[PDB]
Amino acid sequence: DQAGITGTWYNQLGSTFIVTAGADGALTGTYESAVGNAESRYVLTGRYDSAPATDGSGTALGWTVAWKNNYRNAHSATTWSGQYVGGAEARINTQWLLTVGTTNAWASTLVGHDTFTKVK
């Protein structure tokens, strides 16, 4: 589970999620989006259930990226909420919320879904 989550993951858009799962429930790493107003890697942090169902069938987790790095600032942040499912074709299945700051409040949040796998 700690072991299952730690590593490099890829979504359906070609984005790359590099994460380390801590014994304490921490997620730390970097995110590189293949799309949008983004380039290179962005810091992420999050949390996961460090004592889930032992069958690896669904470990709840989430993380945040703020879209500011040394190259760009998109004045926005995405949070992903989902679960890690272990096994031969391990997956992290997520839904996400992307909020844009000021750069029309009602129109400030996009929603979508990303599925991450261990192979691109």
**Residues annotated in the binding site for biotin, as ranges?**
31, 42, 80, 96, 106
Number of residues lying near a copy of itself (CB under 8 A):
62
Give the other-Cβ count within 10 Å of 41's Cβ: 17
Q: Is 19 in the site for a copy of itself (CB under 8 A)?
A: no
Q: Which of 26, 30, 41, 90 binds a copy of itself (CB under 8 A)?
A: 26
Q: How many Å apart are CA 72 and CA 15, to the nearest integer?
A: 17
Residues 6+ apart with CB under 8 A from 88: none
For residue 20, state whether it binds a copy of itself (rule: CB under 8 A). no
Rounded least distance, CB 66 to a copy of itself, Å:
4
Q: Rounded to an integer, what distance in angstroms lies between the CA atom of residue 39 and that of residue 67? A: 9
Distance CA 77, CA 111 (A): 12
Site string for a copy of itself, 51-90 (x = CB under 8 A): xxx-x-xxxxxxxxxxxx----x-xxxxxxxxx-------
Q: How many residues does the chain have?
A: 120
**94: Cα within 13 Å, side-chain hemisphere:** 24
Residue 35 makes contact with a copy of itself by CB under 8 A: yes
Site of interaction with a copy of itself (CB under 8 A)? 13, 24-27, 35-36, 43-53, 55, 57-68, 73, 75-83, 93-113
